[PDB]
Amino acid sequence: VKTLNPKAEVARAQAALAVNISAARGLQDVLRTNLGPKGTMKMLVSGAGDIKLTKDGNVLLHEMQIQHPTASLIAKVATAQDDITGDGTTSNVLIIGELLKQADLYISEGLHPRIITEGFEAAKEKALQFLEEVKVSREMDRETLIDVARTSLRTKVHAELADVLTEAVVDSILAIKKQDEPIDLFMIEIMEMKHKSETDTSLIRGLVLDHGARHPDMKKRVEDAYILTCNVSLEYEKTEVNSGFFYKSAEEREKLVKAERKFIEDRVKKIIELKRKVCGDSDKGFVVINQKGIDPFSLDALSKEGIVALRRAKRRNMERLTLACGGVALNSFDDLSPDCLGHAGLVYEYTLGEEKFTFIEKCNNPRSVTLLIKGPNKHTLTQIKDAVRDGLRAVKNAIDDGCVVPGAGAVEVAMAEALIKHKPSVKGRAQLGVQAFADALLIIPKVLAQNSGFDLQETLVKIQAEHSESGQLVGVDLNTGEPMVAAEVGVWDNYCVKKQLLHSCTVIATNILLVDEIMRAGMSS
Amino acid sequence: EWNDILRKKGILPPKESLKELEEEAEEEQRILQQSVVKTYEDMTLEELEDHEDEFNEEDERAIEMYRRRRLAEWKATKLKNKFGEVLEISGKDYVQEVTKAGEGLWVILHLYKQGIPLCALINQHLSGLARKFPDVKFIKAISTTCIPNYPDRNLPTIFVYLEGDIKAQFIGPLVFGGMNLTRDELEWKLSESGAIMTDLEE
């Protein structure tokens, strides 16, 4: 249809099919090399001369300059997966593309794709019940979550980073406001401190802030500090309603000038009075922090006082310190009591380069803490940030439910065998698709074979023939390839992960394979 | 980046231009390569004598037609070979060949005074040329009886006439001076007059 608009790309059925297949082939073949603790490491260059080192699939999708319909669908789906679960997203695209490749060999054999679609949905259902019956529970303990974190940390990064970060994450999830209610990491921030070794990143109880004394004449390290959380204007303000001063002499000038800095000074005297009432002498710490700014006048008025003040912090900083220090945030001075105050044990400052930092630690009962990443390279910092995000995601997906399934191909080969045996039940040429659907999961271990250096069919048949009378929970080894039981090393994976994996992959494959014609309309000649 | 955004919006910098010139030149270079085989059977007139290395099939329609056109061409060109000796007509008749010399026939009207190796060598070259092009009217004589008291410092002067119109001039030895002057250079000059089509290095 190049007549209604002479400049318009019109492609028929096979044209659309072939272009979708070629794009999927390219994408899947590119992404084969980016999974397992022995995947290939990718380097990317942005549009400025800035370099990021990634093993993440979504990063790769959204950093490639690729302009294509199917590639766009892939980017969106993987973005959603990374948002929700965010681990092993490679599996998504691998499954989708492999199913595309399979169904190609039969649609090319004249099989109209609808029948393959019903075959795939039946395979979905049967594998669903199989995974539901083979999913196994275990009480979440420290070592269980250690192994679960080791899984994802060998998935996305290398050995030593995994070694430190498993400990880091398992301690991170320990700190919680309510063990019996869902955790959230916005109370557990990540700050980048780019001056130390890759092995110097750790977890700090409390919070550390990037901005310090905007009126620097203050102390250097304070102890046993009371915390004031205010959200009031501590700088000079001009009323919204316009008006002006009028006088006739310099005496009126002095009077008006001295009376124009009265309200802010009244506020700071309120604060000083409250401080002295809460604690007098004995050098007890007393920290005031305002979300909004502080003018240099009141800044000096309080800096001559021993009080230390902080201004212009992040909006969620105060909201999390409300719980962290146990105080109550103040939004005006209409009433005040020491209860609204928070507390901390030791507070010190540390300088680096051009910026300084405020450390708040020794919390009485740390319910909000901070993860600090120290590394040389900014891209290294970002990669470690992705790693910690993946670790927290995995531990959350473990703790939220009470069930987990073996990984590394074990349950994959298990439902492969189960569906192969069940296929005699299902009918029609859709049966063939079921076989292809089976071949679907077969991509999962064999790429590891490609990621290990073994003959693919040899290891595949070893593991398949490993099946005793009962279904062995046997995966693929990472150093010998010989069949090995999953429970012995204890590496597993979350249930809803593979669940939504199957959901998304099946539906997107349906959408891809039902298409009939491609247009590029919308061109105004 | 920014430059190509400029390109979509503006044309303030030029950098995407002139990439069609070499493209078209290479296109024509590849195109002109089929002229060697286009007229392979359309140039040689000895291909019949080139049996057993030129024959693959004979359609006898266009190829006998080629013999017919070739023989017509041959008879037309060999019916004109009537010359080959430069001749000495007299000045009394001179009006009758300056004008009544045939229309469509070039006339190399040579004028000379014998005695100088310049004129002698030029006469030798033109006489030898007559052996090659017997389709050209050569005229030699003494300019004194052709033009009364003609300046003897203005010889040998080559005249090129047809239908009483001077087409080419080569006056005196000022354009032929030197014993180093040769056969092919004279032929080159007369070709440059528009009478002959040949090729020479210089």
């Binding site: 492609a11 028929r12 659309a16 072939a18 272009v19 294509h68 319909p69 590029r520 | -």
Partner: protein
């Protein structure tokens, strides 16, 4: 808004390569293009057949109502158009008339084919149904003749027959051209065993219109006599295929002289030799000489002394044709001829025929293998139109010499065939009955044009003609310029047709139909 094209066939094409595939691209496009082409020229070749004109690249004007010339000059970029025009050209090589019938029938059949492929039949089914209907039509057609051609010799029969081919031109005058053509053809036909269309030629003269054209048993040449003497009453004509000059060596006949008397009698001997030769040729007994080559002034001088007529021609075809006509003979030597080899004419007159000089040959014998037709008109396009009408008549006559079978006119035969083939195809098994019936129904397109041209309503008279065909009439057809539904017989009015022309037309049309429908894909290279 970024999408490439499919790798594969779409990516191994040349830059100028174009392509059409399947029922979608190739089939609908060529069918629509063919319908366009058929509809372009669908208003001619009838009693009212409206002539259409065109200008060519050569900047020559052409006013034609037979599709042949107008399509042959027109150029296309559609291969199926090349197919249909080549089909028409093959028809022309077979007979050479009614080039619009094939176009209309092809358009109708391609329309019906597009409809059938819309229905969803295999190409093979429709093709075989059409072929079955084709051979059935070939079988039934000869059973439909009436009043076949008797003699091809009498004059009135020639008038009555060829006028039918003539109505396609010059609606306002019929009998005049009939007289002209009948007289010329009866004069020219040997009537025994053979004929060639080349045996008849015509001549055009600018000036007065058709009212003053004529036919002469004897050629027309515009040439002028070299000698003063012209126009003897009836005399002998000596013809020399060789040039009129004396014996010249085909090699170089140079001469060398050693003494004076050689020069003294050089020209004397030359003149004496040519004098003897010309004297002998004069003593052959004739007075008329028509040479082939150039003429010698001194030999012409002797001819003056011998009072000889001299004409020089250019066409070797004309030379041999003269040998056929006046009994002339070709002599490639200057030797005097024998009286057996002699040319004869009852009149060779150098005259003026409209302020153009002419050499006219005429015999009271009315003999000759070629007779010329002098044409009179005021514009070259009128010459072309009258020559087209004359060609239609004479080729009708030529193809009717053999194959003297006749067919009714007026379109009754096509409707008879449609009704009969539909009745037969009502019983066809398989899925080909639709193809066989639509083949027959396609015979309503010709009367569609025949009714749209004459200014009458088409479908009303079509329904009436079907109603009367239910009565079984092979001779009832539309009344010309009726403006009101009315039909009558055609054999009464001599409105007839040849069998062989229609037979070739339908055969070629079916061949082209099967050809085009068998096409399944179209590939175009880079344009020249």
């Amino acid at each position: 808004l970024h999408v490439p094209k499919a790798p594969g066939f779409a990516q191994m094409l040349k830059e100028g390569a174009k392509h059409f595939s399947g029922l979608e691209e190739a089939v609908y496009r060529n069918i629509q293009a063919c319908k366009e082409l058929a509809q372009t020229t669908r208003t001619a070749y009838g009693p009212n057949g409206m002539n259409k004109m065109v200008i060519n690249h050569l900047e020559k004007l052409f006013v034609t109502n037979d599709a042949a010339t107008i399509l042959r000059e027109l150029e296309v970029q559609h291969p199926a158009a090349k197919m249909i025009v080549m089909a028409s050209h093959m028809q022309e090589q077979e007979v050479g008339d009614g080039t619009n019938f094939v176009l209309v029938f092809a358009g109708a059949l391609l329309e019906l084919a597009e409809e059938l492929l819309r229905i969803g039949l295999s190409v093979s089914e429709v093709i075989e149904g059409y072929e079955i209907a084709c051979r059935k039509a070939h079988e039934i057609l000869p059973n439909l003749v009436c009043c076949s051609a008797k003699n091809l010799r009498d004059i009135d029969e020639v008038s009555s027959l060829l006028r039918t081919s003539i109505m396609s031109k010059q609606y306002g005058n019929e009998v005049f051209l009939a007289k002209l053509i009948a007289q010329a053809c009866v004069s020219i036909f040997p009537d025994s065993g053979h004929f060639n269309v080349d045996n008849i030629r015509v001549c055009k003269i600018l000036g007065s219109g058709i009212s003053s054209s004529s036919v002469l048993h004897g050629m027309v040449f515009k040439k002028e006599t070299e000698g003063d003497v012209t126009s003897v009453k009836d005399a002998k004509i000596a013809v020399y295929s060789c040039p009129f000059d004396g014996m010249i060596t085909e090699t170089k006949g140079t001469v060398l002289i050693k003494t004076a008397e050689e020069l003294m009698n050089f020209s004397k001997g030359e003149e004496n030799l040519m004098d003897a030769q010309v004297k002998a040729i004069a003593d052959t007994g004739a007075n008329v000489v028509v040479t082939g080559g150039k003429v010698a002034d001194m030999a012409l001088h002797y001819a003056n002394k011998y009072n000889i007529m001299l004409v020089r021609l250019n066409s070797k075809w004309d030379l041999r044709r003269l040998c056929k006509t006046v009994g002339a003979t070709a002599l490639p030597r200057l030797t005097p001829p024998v009286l057996e080899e002699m040319g004869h004419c009852d009149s060779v007159y150098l005259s003026e025929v409209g302020d153009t000089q002419v050499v006219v040959f005429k015999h009271e014998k009315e003999d000759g293998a070629i007779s010329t037709i002098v044409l009179r008109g005021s514009t070259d396009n009128l010459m072309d139109d009258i020559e087209r009408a004359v060609d239609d008549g004479v080729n009708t006559f030529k193809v009717l010499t053999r194959d003297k079978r006749l067919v009714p006119g007026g379109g009754a035969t096509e409707i008879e065939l449609a009704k009969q083939i539909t009745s037969y195809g009502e019983t066809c098994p398989g899925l080909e009955q639709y193809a066989i019936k639509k083949f027959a129904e396609a015979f309503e397109a010709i009367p569609r044009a025949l009714a749209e041209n004459s200014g009458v309503k088409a479908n009303e008279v079509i329904s009436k003609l079907y109603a009367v065909h239910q009565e079984g009439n092979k001779n009832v057809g539309l009344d010309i310029e009726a403006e009101v539904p009315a039909v009558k017989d055609m054999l009464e009015a001599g409105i007839l047709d040849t069998y062989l022309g229609k037979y070739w037309a339908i055969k070629l049309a079916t061949n082209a139909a099967v050809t085009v429908l068998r096409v399944d894909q179209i590939i175009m290279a880079k344009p020249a």
